[PDB]
Symmetry: D2
């Protein structure tokens, strides 16, 4: 009825994803200190990998994205980035001399790249993304980030957290879901709000089970939250979401190896 207002946030799921991936890319940029590289290899195209690889094009002569899933070539939006499936990278490493990266970035996280494969490189810089967020015994047990930091003259660990808030992982998707969930809880406590609905679904399923990157990108193109209320809440909805997005802090911690 006209007694109740329906408000869809201006902030879309893709905007939250964008903000998180840009923070991760800037954390890497800052850590690299403008160094130029002949060949950068980034493992893991989903979800921040695509933009991170794009961000390296400026200072890297060649940027290669490596993924175990060949269909993830569809998540790359720049033809300047070379895509290689994991099997073709492993074959080229053994049979050729074209793979000799000076910059290696592992964004695979839990159950990802093996320290054995990383050990085959001798880069100037190695960055490994730490998938751990706040403390969880099970996640900490399966994590092997420290074992992956086994090569490179300069080593760094990319860490991403939500300041003053709890998140189980540093994964782009998890952080976006957590921002939306925390925002809903606070929005629901605003005076006059009847209900608050997050626009969420199992996005990872669209990418990895349905193998449909286009459909996944379409799914991100929608308001993060829908609110039903008696009073106007547009500024409040924006204040809460924006504050939760601003809490994301990404940085590369240098791992000293003398």
């Amino acid at each position: 009825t006209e007694s109740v207002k329906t408000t869809r946030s201006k902030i879309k799921i893709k905007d939250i994803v964008s903000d998180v991936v840009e923070k991760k890319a800037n954390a890497i940029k800052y850590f690299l200190e403008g160094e130029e590289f002949k060949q950068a290899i980034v493992f893991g195209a989903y979800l921040s990998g695509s933009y991170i690889a794009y961000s390296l094009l400026k200072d890297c002569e060649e940027v290669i994205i490596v993924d175990i899933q060949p269909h993830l070539k569809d998540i790359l939006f720049n033809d300047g980035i070379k895509f290689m499936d994991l099997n073709k990278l492993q074959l080229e490493l053994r049979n050729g001399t074209s793979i000799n990266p000076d910059l290696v970035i592992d964004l695979t996280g839990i159950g990802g790249v093996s320290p054995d494969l990383i050990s085959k490189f001798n880069p100037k810089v190695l960055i490994v993304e730490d998938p751990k967020g706040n403390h969880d015994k099970g996640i900490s047990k399966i994590d092997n980030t420290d074992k992956r930091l086994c090569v490179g003259a300069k080593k760094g660990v990319l860490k991403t957290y939500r300041s003053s808030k709890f998140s189980k992982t540093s994964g782009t998707m998890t952080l976006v879901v957590d921002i939306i969930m925390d925002s809903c809880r606070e929005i629901n406590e605003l005076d006059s709000v009847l209900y608050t609905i997050p626009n969420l679904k199992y996005f990872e399923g669209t990418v990895f089970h349905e193998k449909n990157v286009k459909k996944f990108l379409t799914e991100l193109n929608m308001s993060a939250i829908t609110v039903s209320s008696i009073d106007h809440v547009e500024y409040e909805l924006e204040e809460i979401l924006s504050k939760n997005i601003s809490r994301v802090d990404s940085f590369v911690k240098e791992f000293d190896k003398l």
Copy 2:
């Protein structure tokens, strides 16, 4: 049953959104049944087909000779699943009340909530029993001001107010879909704290959009036919996933509070 790799498990809850909706609607229908104490009626009029109205009207067929659902939205006739229930849009009800003699209900149930039926329309009836659903959940100044439940309780020899809350939990309204959303949201919060869980996703969307803007009841019913929650974790969580959701569904308590009058 896996995620990005085989090191992570993806678990979809066995409980679907429709199962939660069903549990809530059934509690509201049982609260009305209990209040009516088996009384038989010649003509029952239920205002508001979405969301619990459809099942509530169906539940009255046993003791009511004629059951009529009234809705301001004509397309909501599509949410009725029993041909025994008569549907009338609000305009047809108003005109037949003013110009005919076929509308004289002995049982009136108002489930419209906020911005719904007017006390003026309710005042045109002289039923044996009047039940008005209170849309208010936990206290909210804004919601309490627009609410006029007490003004709608203006006719009937026996009067009752249908109230629905989540025991020891916070909900802004008693609306079926608000309660379902809140059960899922609170369940996600708790599931996320289970050891080894990476993330928890509630399968939610603006369901009111499908029903009132797209005017698609079939699509809405299809949207309810899916897992309430999807969890990404390192260890098995199936047991906890169903237990947490079930515990939250069980907190729903619906009852008709009798409004004393002569």
Copy 3:
């Protein structure tokens, strides 16, 4: 704090200020419901915690205001000599054996396990107000509650209800609402950047009032900051804003119970 790198900030808002705001809202809700009517004799059951101020607020329009409490030591919580204090035993004996008790205004603030509908039924006042101890829905609490059974006399009847708008509270009790405001405020303050920890200055207040039977000590315990925060950056503004916003959410009103 432990070093000069950490700041310790005590809220300017004291526990007593929160109590004051809540009791005043309950008294104003009753005032607006009474619509300026004058009474010869008002009887208020339950001195702790809002009862004392509510009885004081009735002095303007009531010739005689009597506070009745089952605990005789609660005469100490009254701050105005104009209010008559009567223990429950004397009231019950006076009702049965005398003619001095015939109130035109009766207010029951005892809540759960309080005054019986049988005692209320002995009065024939112009106005009866019963405080509803229920806050948000709880099956266990709704089962023991008998507010509706207590609203059995009076030409005009009302139920005093108190909630925190958009927040969760199990009861409408003054001290519980204060505790809940402080607890919710701590949770939000802890999430401010640079905060190390947030401590609510709370204790078992009823122990002082009802077990130690020391009203003065209890009043001293309320005379202290509601929250203490340890942080790296200044948080004074946010600390007061969060607490003030939570206090503002308290809403008290008397719902008239129609009886033609």
Copy 4:
């Protein structure tokens, strides 16, 4: 038909005890039974006292160092030698009695300087990381990594609450957070009318009033008081125990090939 008042059997001191014991066991596990001639622990409050006591078994001499002389009162074993910071610094410059093989820094934020730590050459150095979950302000003032500047074997003592948010690893903070989270859950139990934690600014008693005895008395109180219609004793203790069990303390070895 009656309102019940229940005080938790678990006292604030029991929660403090459980946290300090986890920190001491994390250090024990990391030391792998190694024996030391002289251990120096910086920071007596709050876990320092018990940690120093726990080192007595494998260390010939255990010394607690604190910038506050009145903190000698928090030591419960006469076998631990107390030294104020000025007396340690004096003995380092003018004497030869201070040459620890085990150094443990538990001072946290605004504590011991890396310059003082650099004066030692121990077999093992352990620095407690005061950071809990991420906070920009706390991360900026923290200098734990700069303090890991000596020792053949280096470790960082980390303490968190599994699946729960805490701003620091400080014993006090963790106890407060366990009680606060427990109250929040207890309040949602059916029939509960109210839940009150017994909390106050304990640090003020120790550092401003300089009264360790009064502080210890303040910990000897039930953590929570609950008012309810139904019995909740079992659930009260279960929620508190489950929150205490979430505390996880461990020493993460800080690899340094040169040392």
